[PDB]
Subunit: 388 residues, 4 copies
C-alpha cells in the first residue's frame, strides 16, 4: 500500500541463529533441481524467498556439463520458497540474464537482469513484473551488478553497477530507481578504487554497501548511500581483520582509504554490518580458497584501523566449501529494530571438485539474535562420490 | 472489471531486449517437460504466460516418437508461467485440440481450440474457462486458426480462421466474438490470395494481422481489422524485404496487391509491426530453411514497394534452428504507449535433426526498447547428442 | 454465497464437443502419474476438476503390481485440474477409501468416501473439507456408492448407496444430506431390482440417476429423485437400445419395469440423459467387453419400449478400450439451460492387457452442442509395448 | 481475526474413522518423496496439514543412506497438504532443525525448531513465518520438544521442552508463548520423574499432555496445563493398561504418582484422551517393538489404578510396523464439541528392516466418531523387496 521507509536501527547482534537452508545439492542428486549460482535472499511484505541465477539445466542433466562458466544465454534470475530447493517445478523466473539484483519497495518488486555478450551487455529493469527501463553498457566490458538484494527508501532503490575491467580501473555507477525509472545516476566517488558485487542493508534512512575490490584490495570497500539526497561516499573497512578471499594474513593495522595489498585480481562477494560496537564481519576461514565461513564481531571495524575480534561464530568449517555471501533483512517484521541477516553460498563441483563436470551450490542463511546462542556448522552435506 | 480498449500507439522501437526464454529442451533432457509446438505468449491484466500446443507426452517419454505429426487426439492448448518450461506439473490446459488462439478482453480470457479429423473438424470457444460456442468446419479441410494471441477492443475479439486447401484457394473467415459469442463473421476481402496463421496486434482502435500465404506468396499478407465497425481489408507487405520461408532472394521491388512468386506451397508463421517509419519485420535468416531470425527496420514496409533496411538486430544466428514467430503486447502495462513484443519458436528434432524420433521446441521472446541496446543471439541451447 | 437451485432445463443436444482429456497413461509412461480408476468430473462455482480413486502408487512404480484389485487401504478419492493428469504433485486428496461421490451445493463441497473390509465398511461424509458424519455398513457386504458426482438442490444433496450382494438382492438406500448431515434416508422403491453406481444430473428441481443393475438387467435402472419432497421412484429404461455391458443383442422391444435378461452378474457404470425427444444414451460398442463408446439419440427412451436411434456419435472406436462412464454438468455456467456433459474412463492394463501387471485409465470428457458437429474418436493413445 | 479459545468439551468417542493417509513410502518408491520422521498433523482455521522432520534427501536418493540418525544439519520441519506425500515439490519448510512443534492460535501459526550440536542446541520460535524469539540450551544435552502440535488458548500457547539426560534426571520446562514471545516459564512440577515428547490437546480451557517417561516409566506421564493462570501439574496414567513401548505385561494395578517399572531407558511418543468414561488410550500391540497399534477405551484411566478396557479398535496389525503417535484436533470445525484425532507414524527401514540403508515413514490418521464403526487395519503398504 505505502512505500517502505528505513525508520529503524539494527538490533543488537549477540549471535546468529539458523534462518534457512535448502540442501539443494543433496536433494538434487535424485530430483529435478536446477543448477544455480550467485544466490541471495530477499523479502517481500508477506514472504521471504531464495533468489539465484539458474543455469538452465538440472544438475543430473547432461547439460550441467560446462556450468562453471558464468555467462550464457541459458541463465535467468529465479526465485523460490524459503528453504525449498530451486526445482524446475517450484521456481519462478524473475527475468533473463547472468547478473542481477532485486528488491521490494513496500508496494512491489523491482528486479534487474543483465544479459548479452561481454562487449554489448544491457540491463533490463522490471517493476511489478513488467519491463520498464533498459540501460546499455557504457564501458563495453561485462556490465554487472550486485548479485544480492538492493534496498529501498520511500520508493527510491539505489543499485550499484560496474562496467569495465575486473583487473584494473572500471566505471562504477549508482543508479537511483523509482518505480523502475531512473531518477538519477552518479559515477562512483570517495576512495574505493574498484567495486564489484555490493551487499547492501538499510537502517535509519541510510543504505550501507560492503563490496569486493577485485583489482587491488583484500580489505573491502564500503559505499554509504543517502537515498533521500541521492548522494553517496566510499571508503574501505579500516580493520586489519581482512575479509576478501584470497587474502594475505591479518596485519595489526589496516587501511581506511586505500586497498590493503598482497593479493591482486581476485576476490569474492561478501558483506558486513557496520554499526559501531555492534559491528560484525563475514569471511571465509581460508585465506587461500573459498572454504569455511565465520562471523567476527569487530567493534568499529569501519573507522578503527587497529580493531580486532571480541567475539565470533563459526558458520561453515574450514573443511567445507563456501562461496559468495550477502546481506538481507526483513524490513517488514514487527518490532523496534531491524534484524540483520545473511546467506552464504556453498559452492560444489568445479573447479575444486573436478571429478564432476558441473558447478552448483546450496544456501545457508542466518539472522541475528540478542541471545548468546550456541553455534553449529552448516555444510552443504552432499557426497560428490554419489554423483560419479 | 472493464473491457480493455486499444487507446495507445506503439512505442518507438529502437531495438529489442530479452523478455523471456524457457530453455525447455535443455531442461527437458532430464525433467518432465511436455513435448510442444506452435507456441505463443499472451497477457492477462496481472500476468503474462507462455502458451503452446502439447503433444500429450514428455520428451523423454517413449510416446515422443512420432510427434512430428501436427494433429492428433493427444494435443491440447496449454499455458504456463513466463520463462518456466511446460512441464507436466506446472501446465494448465486451456482446451483440447490441434490449432488455437487465445486472448484476454480486460475482464476474462477467451481461448479457442480446434480438433477433429481433417474433413470434420470443429472449433470450441471457451470464455471464462467454460465452453460457450462451437463452429463446424465449412470447407471440410483442416479448419485452422492463428496459433498466436488474438486482440480485443471493448469486448470484441476478432479471430481469423482458414478452412480449405493449404496449396490452392481456401475459405478464410473473420469471426467477431464477444464474451465467446459470435457477433458477426465475414469472408476474407481485399487482395490477399491465401491466409494462414495470423499474428495480430492492436493500437489506436485498429487490429493489424501479419499472416502466411502458404499458396503463392513469399511476401506476407496483412489484414487490418476495425473492431468497432467489425470490418476489414487485406493486402501484402509491399516491401522487397521478403519475410516468409522458404523464399527467393530479395528483389529491388515488391508487390502490394499480389503474391511475390518464386516459392509455392510452403511457408512459416511470422509477424511484423507496421507503423510508418517505426516499422519492423521479422524473418528467418535462411531463405531455404527455418534457421536464424532477425529483425529489420524497414520504414513504410507496408506501403513502399522499394523500402529496404535502415537498422536491424540478430535474434538467432543462422547456425541455430528457428520456427514460428508471432506478436503479442502487454496491453495492461503502465505508460503512454504499447510496447511491441514477439516470440520465436526454436524447433528441435525432426525433420532437420532426425537422429531423434521427436520434434519439440523452446521459446525466446523479446520486447522493444527506446534505447539502442546491444544485441546477443538466443539459441535453444540443447545438444541433440545428449538425447541419443 | 447461496445454495444452488436446479432452475434450468437441458439444452438441446445436437451433438457433443470435446471438453477434456488427460492423456494420463501416455504421459505417465515417463512421469509421476498416479495409478487410478473410477474417475469422474465435478464442478465448483469457479472450477471444474477431475476426480478419481488413486491406488496409492505411480504407474511406473513397482507398487502398481496388483492394482487390478478394487479395494485396499492405499486408495483415496483425489482431484486435480481439468485435463491435467493425476500426478503425485498436483493431486489433492478429498478423503480416504475405495468408493466415492462428491458434489458442490453452491456454498461448498461434500465428498463421501467408503473404506473398510468387505463386511465392516463405513462411509465418512466430508463437508467443507472436514469430516461431519459417518455411516456404518447395514448389510455387511461392500457398502458402496455412485463413483460419480452427486447433485444438490437448495442444500439437499441425495446420494445413492448399495450394501449387499452384487449377484442377488441387496439393500439400496437414498440418503438426503444437507451440510453433510443426514436429513432423511429411504430404502429403494419402484421397480428397479438391483442398483449400483448411479450417474446423476439435475434439471428443473428433479434429479435423474441412471444406474447399473449388476444382478439381472442389461437395460439400465433409472431413479428419479425429488430433492424438495425428498422422495423418489425407480424403473428401467424402456428402450430396446440396451446400454449395459456385457449385454445381449438389441431386441425390438424392451422392458419398463423389469430387467431385460440374457446376462447375469455383470455390468458397467454408465449414464444417460432422459429428456423426451432430447434423450441420449451412452454405451460401449461391444456387447461383450468394455470397448468402444457411442452416444445414441433415442427419443423417449425412458418411456417408449420400441424407441430406436435417430442420430448418434462415435466417441471411442470399437478397437480401443473404454470403461465406466458418467454424467456431470456445470450448474454455474451462464445461459438459459444446463449443458449436458459426460466422461468415459479408458481402462488400460489388466485384465485385457495382461502383459503389464497394472490397471489404470485415462479420461475423455464431452459436452453437448446445439450445433451438428463433426465427430472424431478419442482413444487413450498409449502403447502397452512401451511399458514392457 | 480473533484468538481461538478452548470453549468446547470432547465429543463422545464410540470409535475412530479414517482421516488421512499418505502412502508415502509406496509412492516414494518411484517419485521424489522426502525422507522423513517424527510426523504430526496440525490444523489452521482453513486447512489441516501434515507436518514432519525432513532428512534433506529423497528416499531413492543415495543421501538416504544414514537417515536412521536423528539429528543433522540437513533436517527441517516441513508441512504439506493432508494425505499427499511429502515431496520435494509440494513441501513447505516451516523452519530448520531436528526437533519441533507447531500450532495456530486463531490468528497465525507459531512453529518451533531446535537445532545444534548435542551440547549447544538452541530453539528458534517463529510466528507469522518470521523468527521472533530464541532460547539457548540450559542443560547442554539435546534440548528437545514435543514433536507434535501445541495448543493455544487466547493467544497463550504452552510448549514443553526437555534438556538433559534421556536416561536419568533432566530439566523439563514449560514455556508460555504469546505471539512468539515468552510470557513465562516454569520448571516441571508434580510427580512425573521424566518427560519427553508431549502429545497435547485442549478442551474447556485446559490443556492435557500425554508424554513419554524415557527413564523409568512404562505408564505415561501426564501434564495438565491451565493456560489462563499459566500453571500446571503432573502425574502418571493410573491405569494398568500400560501404553509405552517397550513395556512389561499389563498388571492388575498401576501407579498414579510413580513410574511403573520393568523397562528402563527407552520408550516411544504416544498419546491419550483422558475424559472420564470417554477415555481412550493408544499403544503398540507388541510389548517388545514398535509394531501394531490399538485404541482401547479405559474408563477413568487417569484416576483409577485398576481400570481395564471396555472397548477397542485395531489401527495397525501386530505384523506391521508402527512408531510415534500423537494427538491433534481441528479446533475450528463447526459443532458443539471437539473431535478427538490422532496420527500414527509407520516407520519403515532401519533398524528393523536393515536390507535398506534408510529409515523413513508414512502416516495414518484417525478421528473419533459417535457411531460404532467397523474397523480395518491401516499398514504402510510398501514392499521393502522393491527397494532392493
Ligand atoms: C557453544 O556456543 C558458543 C557460541 O558459539 C561457543 O562460544 C564461542 O566460542 C567461539 C570459539 O571459541 C568464540 O569465538 C572466538 O571468539 C574470539 C574472541 O574471543 C576472545 O577475545 C576477547 C578479547 O581479547 C582482547 O581483549 C581482551 C580483554 O578484553 C584481552 O584479554 C585479549 O588479550 C585481547 O587483546 C575476549 O573478550 C574473549 O573472552 C570472553 O569469552 C570467552 C569465551 O570464548 C570466556 O572464556 C572469557 O572468560 C571471556 O568472558 C575471548 O578471549 C575470536 O578471537 C576467535 O576468532 C579468532 O580465532 C578463530 C580461530 O578459532 C579464527 O578462525 C578467527 O579468524 C580469529 O582468529 C584469527 O584472526 C585474528 C584477527 O586478525 C587473529 O588474531 C588470529 O591470529 C587469527 O588469524 C589467523 O587465522 C585467520 C583465519 O584463518 C587468518 O585470516 C589470519 O590470516 C591468521 O592466519 C573466535 O571467533 C565465541 O566468541 C564464543 N562465544 C561466546 C558467546 O562465548 C562455545 O565454545 C560453544 N560451547 C561448546 C561447549 O562447544
Ligand atoms: C552492439 O550491438 C549493436 C546493436 O545490435 C550492433 O550494432 C548493430 O549492428 C547490426 C549488424 O551490423 C546492424 O544491423 C544491420 O543494419 C543494417 C542497416 O544498417 C545500414 O544501412 C543504413 C542505410 O543504408 C541506405 O541508406 C544510407 C544512407 O542513409 C546509404 O548510405 C546506403 O548506401 C543505403 O542505401 C545506414 O543508415 C546504416 O549506417 C549507420 O549505422 C552504422 C552501424 O551499423 C554506423 O556505422 C553508421 O556510421 C551509421 O550511423 C547502416 O550502414 C542492415 O542492412 C543489416 O541487414 C542486412 O544484412 C544482414 C547481414 O548482416 C542480413 O542478414 C539482413 O538480411 C540484411 O541484408 C540482406 O537483406 C537486404 C535487403 O533486401 C539486402 O540488401 C542484403 O543484400 C541482404 O540480402 C541477402 O541476405 C538475406 C538474408 O539472408 C536474404 O534474404 C537475401 O535473399 C540476400 O541473400 C543489419 O540488420 C544494426 O543496425 C546495428 N545497430 C545499431 C544500433 O547500430 C553492434 O555491432 C554491436 N557491437 C559490437 C561491438 O558487436
Ligand atoms: C462428420 O460428422 C458427422 C457427425 O458425427 C457424421 O455424421 C454422423 O454419422 C454417424 C455415423 O453414420 C451417424 O450416426 C448414426 O446415426 C444412425 C441414425 O441415423 C439414421 O436413422 C434415422 C431414422 O431411421 C428410422 O426412421 C427413418 C425415417 O425417419 C427411416 O427411414 C428408417 O428406416 C428408420 O426406421 C434417419 O433419420 C437418419 O437419416 C438422416 O441423416 C443421414 C446421415 O447419417 C442423412 O444421410 C439422411 O439423408 C437423413 O437426413 C439416418 O439414416 C444410427 O442408427 C447409427 O447407430 C447405429 O449404427 C452404429 C453402427 O455404425 C452402431 O454402432 C449403433 O449401435 C447403431 O446400430 C446398432 O443399434 C441399433 C439399435 O438397436 C440396431 O438397429 C443396429 O442393428 C445396430 O445393432 C448392432 O450393433 C450394436 C452396437 O454394436 C449392438 O449393441 C447390437 O446388439 C447389434 O449387434 C449411428 O449412430 C450420425 O447420426 C451422423 N450425424 C449427423 C449429424 O448426420 C459424418 O459421417 C461425418 N462426416 C464424414 C465425412 O466422416
Ligand atoms: C466390525 O467392527 C467392529 C468394530 O471394530 C468389531 O467389533 C469390535 O471388536 C473388537 C475386537 O474384538 C473389540 O475390541 C476388543 O474389545 C475388548 C473389550 O470388550 C470386552 O470387554 C467388556 C467388559 O469386560 C469386563 O466387564 C464385563 C461386563 O461389563 C465382564 O463380563 C468381563 O468379564 C470384564 O471384567 C465387555 O463389555 C465387552 O462385551 C460387549 O461387546 C461384545 C463385542 O466385542 C459383544 O459380544 C458383547 O455381547 C457385549 O455387548 C467385551 O467382552 C478389549 O478387551 C479387547 O482388547 C484386548 O484384547 C486385544 C486382543 O484382541 C489386545 O490386543 C488388547 O491389548 C486387549 O487385551 C490385552 O490387554 C488387556 C488389559 O490389560 C489384558 O486383559 C489382556 O490380557 C491383553 O493383554 C495382553 O496383550 C497385550 C497387548 O499385546 C499386552 O500389552 C499385555 O501385556 C498382555 O500380553 C479389544 O479391544 C471391540 O470393542 C468391538 N467393538 C464393538 C463396537 O463391538 C467387529 O468384530 C467387526 N466385525 C467383524 C465381523 O469383523
Ligand atoms: C574444503 C577444503 O577441504 N578446503 C581446504 C582447507 O580445508 C584447507 F586445508 C586449505 F589448506 C586452505 O586453503 O586453508 O586448503 C583448502 C583447499 O582444499 C585447497 C585447494 O586450498
Ligand atoms: C541450423 C543450420 O545449421 N542451418 C543451415 C544453415 O546454417 C545454412 F548453412 C543453410 F545452408 C541455409 O539453408 O542457409 O542450411 C541450413 C540447413 O542445415 C540446410 C538443411 O538447409
Ligand atoms: C479393444 C479391442 O480390441 N476390443 C475387441 C473388439 O475390437 C472386438 F473385436 C471384440 F470382438 C468384441 O468384443 O466385439 O472383442 C474385443 C476384445 O478384444 C475381446 C477380448 O472381446
Ligand atoms: Ca580483492
Ligand atoms: Ca509462402
Ligand atoms: Ca447388468
Ligand atoms: Ca518408558
Amino acid at each position: 500500500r505505502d512505500f517502505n521507509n528505513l525508520t529503524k536501527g539494527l538490533c543488537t547482534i549477540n549471535s546468529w541463529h539458523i534462518y534457512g537452508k535448502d540442501n539443494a545439492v543433496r536433494i538434487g542428486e535424485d530430483s529435478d533441481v536446477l543448477v544455480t549460482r550467485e544466490p541471495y535472499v530477499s523479502c517481500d511484505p508477506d514472504e521471504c524467498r531464495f533468489y539465484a541465477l539458474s543455469q538452465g539445466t538440472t544438475i543430473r542433466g547432461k547439460h550441467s556439463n560446462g556450468t562453471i562458466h558464468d555467462r550464457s544465454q541459458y541463465r535467468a534470475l529465479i526465485s523460490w520458497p524459503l528453504s525449498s530447493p530451486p526445482t524446475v517445478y517450484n521456481s519462478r523466473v524473475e527475468c533473463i540474464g547472468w547478473s542481477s539484483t532485486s528488491c521490494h519497495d513496500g508496494k512491489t518488486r523491482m528486479s534487474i537482469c543483465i544479459s548479452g555478450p561481454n562487449n554489448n551487455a544491457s540491463a533490463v529493469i522490471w517493476y511489478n513484473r513488467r519491463p520498464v527501463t533498459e540501460i546499455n553498457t557504457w564501458a563495453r566490458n561485462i556490465l554487472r551488478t550486485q548479485e544480492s538484494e538492493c534496498v529501498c527508501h520511500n520508493g527510491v532503490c539505489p543499485v550499484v553497477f560496474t562496467d569495465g575491467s575486473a583487473t584494473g580501473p572500471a566505471e562504477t555507477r549508482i543508479y537511483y530507481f523509482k518505480e523502475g525509472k531512473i531518477l538519477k545516476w552518479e559515477p562512483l566517488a570517495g576512495t574505493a578504487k574498484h567495486i564489484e558485487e555490493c551487499s547492501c542493508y538499510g537502517e535509519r534512512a541510510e543504505i550501507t554497501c560492503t563490496c569486493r575490490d577485485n583489482w587491488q584490495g583484500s580489505n573491502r570497500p564500503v559505499i554509504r548511500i543517502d537515498p533521500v539526497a541521492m548522494t553517496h561516499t566510499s571508503q574501505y573497512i579500516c580493520s586489519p581483520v581482512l575479509t576478501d578471499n584470497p587474502r594475505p594474513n591479518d596485519p595489526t593495522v589496516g587501511k581506511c582509504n586505500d586497498p590493503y595489498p598482497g593479493n591482486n585480481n581476485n576476490g569474492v562477494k561478501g558483506f558486513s554490518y557496520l554499526d559501531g560496537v555492534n559491528t560484525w564481519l563475514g569471511r571465509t576461514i581460508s585465506i587461500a580458497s573459498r572454504s569455511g565461513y565465520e562471523m567476527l564481531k569487530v567493534p568499529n571495524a569501519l573507522t578503527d584501523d587497529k580493531s580486532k575480534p571480541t567475539q565470533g561464530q563459526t558458520i561453515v568449517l574450514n573443511t567445507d566449501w563456501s562461496g559468495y555471501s550477502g546481506s538481507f533483512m526483513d524490513y517488514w517484521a514487527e518490532g523496534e529494530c531491524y534484524r540483520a541477516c545473511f546467506y552464504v553460498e556453498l559452492i560444489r563441483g568445479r573447479p575444486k571438485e573436478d571429478k564432476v563436470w558441473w558447478t552448483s551450490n546450496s544456501i545457508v542463511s542466518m539472522c541475528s539474535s540478542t541471545e548468546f546462542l550456541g553455534q553449529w556448522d552448516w555444510p552443504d552435506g552432499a557426497k560428490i562420490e554419489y554423483f560419479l
